[PDB]
Design a binder for these strands. Sequence first.
DNA 1: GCTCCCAGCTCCCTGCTGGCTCCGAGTGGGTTCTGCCGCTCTCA
DNA 2: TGAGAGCGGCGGAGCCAGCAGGGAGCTGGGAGC
Lengths: 62, 113, 116, 672, 95, 98
Amino acid sequence: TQFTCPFCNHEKSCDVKMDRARNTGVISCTVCLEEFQTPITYLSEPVDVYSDWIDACEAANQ
Amino acid sequence: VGIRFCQECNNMLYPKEDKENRILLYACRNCDYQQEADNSCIYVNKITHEVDELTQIIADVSQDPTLPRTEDHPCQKCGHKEAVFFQSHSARAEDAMRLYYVCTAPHCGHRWT
Amino acid sequence: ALETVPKDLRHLRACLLCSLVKTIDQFEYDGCDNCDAYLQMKGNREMVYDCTSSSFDGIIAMMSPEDSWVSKWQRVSNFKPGVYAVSVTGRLPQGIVRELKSRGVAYKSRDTAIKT
Amino acid sequence: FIQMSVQRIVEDAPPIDLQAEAQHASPPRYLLKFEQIYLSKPTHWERDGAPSPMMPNEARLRNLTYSAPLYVDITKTVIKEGEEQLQTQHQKTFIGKIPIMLRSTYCLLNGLTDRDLCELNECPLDPGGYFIINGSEKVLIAQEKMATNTVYVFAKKDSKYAYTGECRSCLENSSRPTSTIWVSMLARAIGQRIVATLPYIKQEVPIIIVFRALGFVSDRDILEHIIYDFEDPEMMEMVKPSLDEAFVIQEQNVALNFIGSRGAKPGVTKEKRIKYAKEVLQKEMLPHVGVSDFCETKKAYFLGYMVHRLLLAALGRRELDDRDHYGNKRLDLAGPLLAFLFRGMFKNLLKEVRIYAQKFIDRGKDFNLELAIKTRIISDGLKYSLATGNWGDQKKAHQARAGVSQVLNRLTFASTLSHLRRLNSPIGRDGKLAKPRQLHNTLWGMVCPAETPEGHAVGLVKNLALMAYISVGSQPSPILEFLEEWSMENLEEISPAAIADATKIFVNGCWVGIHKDPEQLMNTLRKLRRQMDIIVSEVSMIRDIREREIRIYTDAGRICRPLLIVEKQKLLLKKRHIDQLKEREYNNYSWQDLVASGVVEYIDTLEEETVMLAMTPDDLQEKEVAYCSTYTHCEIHPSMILGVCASIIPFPDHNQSPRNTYQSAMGKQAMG
Amino acid sequence: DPNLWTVKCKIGEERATAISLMRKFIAYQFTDTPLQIKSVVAPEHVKGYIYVEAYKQTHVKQAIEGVGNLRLGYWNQQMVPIKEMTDVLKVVKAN
Amino acid sequence: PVPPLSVRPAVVMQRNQDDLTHKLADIVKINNQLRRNEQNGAAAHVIAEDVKLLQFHVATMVDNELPGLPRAMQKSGRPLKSLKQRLKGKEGRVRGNL
DNA sequence: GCTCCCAGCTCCCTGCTGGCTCCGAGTGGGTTCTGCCGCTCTCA
DNA sequence: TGAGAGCGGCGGAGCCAGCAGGGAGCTGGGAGC
Ligand SMILES: [Zn+2]
Ligand SMILES: [Zn+2]
Ligand SMILES: [Zn+2]
Ligand SMILES: [Zn+2]
């Protein structure tokens, strides 16, 4: 459930919250307070949300 | 049963209700292709699993050297004396000591119990 | 400019004024990359001994004097990229210090090591 | 081993290329190719040099190691930054010395006559087959194991899985070890979903995701590889749950990300994930079916077959495989054991040579290959593993399995003979599971039923039958060339429409193709094997009739026995054969001619499942009250089912069976 | 400010490695793939590792790539605590 | 506490020190390193690593086998016989010698 | 401003999954094995 | 500064602790007056 932050590079500083009611997976860093939201399916895992966040960060950086 | 693929994109059709007409229709998940149903039946489950093994019996099994063959039971179709006989394999069989006979002669292929 | 980095680990000295670490041969040949205009250390082994001290603590590689916090900590943010020691122990001769003061160059000790 | 396997291990090792660090410059490449081995007969190498042939008796007396030095040739081609290649070759480079087996084709006693052996203070009656190390005899006990490249479906008790289908896959004795893959069905809210445990992946993956990742994006296409007959609603309704679990991933790339994310390596950037998953599917998953630039269609067909096999077992159509059935066992003899050890040991030598060369070229001065190779690592390593018994690297001696290569028992000739013919099950002793220890039906005529140690290893250490022969293995290429001439179509050409009615052909476990006519092809293959034309005697060919598979096996370690062939209730052995054999000293008409005549056959356990045997020709092939009228083989003599120590008991059928076992154990201790 | 990382190095060779690192930086500062790290610090009594200043650990991994002395520190590098930053440069020393 | 020589005797001919003496040597060696290192360098990072290794060595003196931890190995790889291993089980001090 | 009823928070309970220890008693032999590379300082 | 050499370092079963999910039961905000 924890991952290394891509922005403030703090290991285990990322926590993932699953909201199945709205079908969203949210990952928050506990150091730089970076917030990212991405839709999830019923078959989804925190690694998928982390993967989605890293892809969005790479796309934002082009 | 009648499990039927989408004509256009080749995928499983899913059952659906047309609520305005309360009519069962088979609709693809991917295109708007729809079809009218002809069995009102969707899910069927034989819990007792009274399966007729004669559907699964293959005539080619008559070529087995290790199987026993007899002439006391003649074929009801062609009257041929020689016939190979063997039992069921599955635990689900309704009769444990059920004996299946396959006609030994080529191209009769008659199978009975 | 590789002239601001050592070619070998023998007879290394540190400039007492800017903490530049070079071989004594480099100091003799090309002088100090940051003090030769005020010292004229080229071609004078005795003057090299006077102004550079073989004894120092630490090694720091410096690449971005304008973009390094260690440059600010060491007060070397206006010096050329090179091999810079963390602490250089020693003191210049009094005559050279007075000459620098007369020119207008204040002499601050590079021995930032905590004593006792 | 010493003829083919050492050469292929040396040649298939990748060439090493290594450059410098560009010191001050921030640098060139070279190849160091090994190509051909040259093996010498054993030689002394006393302190002075000047080699002379070492006689095994001398090795025993002087505590030497009866070994033979081997040499390899290396061509090192180095290019420099000026764009020019310098190619220097070295012949007869000393790599090490391999301990050699007595009376083998490379021993000094090979081909000698009895008078010559008596001159050398050697016993003509000594069967050899053992190594001499530090002047002590060592015997590599054969080690049994589960067969490879074959789908096994088991049903473990009290686990989250109802049924699991596994296929331990290996290439042609390549560097990679057994890369097992599991396909399991969950144990039933909604259920009976199917997951795959594939190598280098942390979490199990649903099968339809793997199929999507493999390159099949449609639904009918995926189903065609699993269900061969769409007219079976039971299979459709059983597989649709796992199919609806994958409703959300309709392209290859998303599935590729799905696999890469679940990697055991740290999981960070998109293309990294894609490449990792593609590599896992290309080389780590199912290697035996093919590791090449394009094997996706063949890999998908085999995976679909495993799922189909799992569905059949879970539907009761087929029966779960038995772990004790000797058709699923393989015996590693000296050859495969030494090959497994030598592969990793040669790799270690290459790594040390690479380290030495890199250290010297960091300064950019020349490296010397003579000092680069350490001749000690192979020779002293082999000597250690065969002297202590720990099969593996010395640095991990606790992890390595022990008990292999025991001291040859030299109390009585029967003891020596029995020790040379011994199979060991590598299962933990002092276990409370008695099923592996029981005498299984498939041991008939291949493992002596009387002879086992009575201590804590009852039923684990077992002796070999008198006429049992263990296959040595051969290439399946000629069989493949023959098959596709005889109206056999590969998977890449057939459509799944006709895959239901035809029979599937397996060669060494890999699904090669399909054929429309199952019967007259087995006849042709039987004729070839009885003529030895294109199919050697060891190849075993099994046709399953109820289940349309027909399998061909050419692996090593399969155990088999000779049986007389029967045609229409009559032996093929006639008076002329016996007449020729009875005068054998003058006509050199040996057993090999009898095999070549098409009279006898070698049958292993898999083929013995589908054969009809006759205990005695005269007494069981006659007109009487018919029991069977379709006997296929006959036994040469029942007394051949016993072993070596159990073949000295007079009237062993007039005794209680525990007494026979006690005599088998006690015959090894009788003084003579 | 860029982050400090400890990169594993051979014992007794750390000094030559730092000089070699700086030399390679200067050489690569004119190429399409320059060394994006900032500075290298080799204290007097630090054995088996070197301090490196970079914003991203990926920059550290790429910059130290190809260095034999840092092959053990190639796969993993350790985040220096921020409050410990002042102790990287702290030097202490009659008798 | 370090036990006397009777608890950890040294054999005369194959001096080969006891499996416990080698662990004692690792403990004292790393103790001196940490002592000296925190005396002068006081770098606040190597102290953490030194403490971790010292706490690993101390723990594996008494209990060599732990879940999820590497076992201390003698040269030729064989794991050390800890005090708990000496005393635990069928061949031990209590059940096998008392 | 008054009493009171309905949702939000507190508690305990139940249920489930991961982690540690045990696996007969004696006896006799034999065999292998107890690290290794090299790197810097000293006597010559 | 080279030889001698000192050593420096490189399977299975069955009990206990934590976690997760789910109700009864108490207290502030609104329903009536
Ligand atoms: Zn962060
Ligand atoms: Zn459609
Ligand atoms: Zn008929
Ligand atoms: Zn200077």
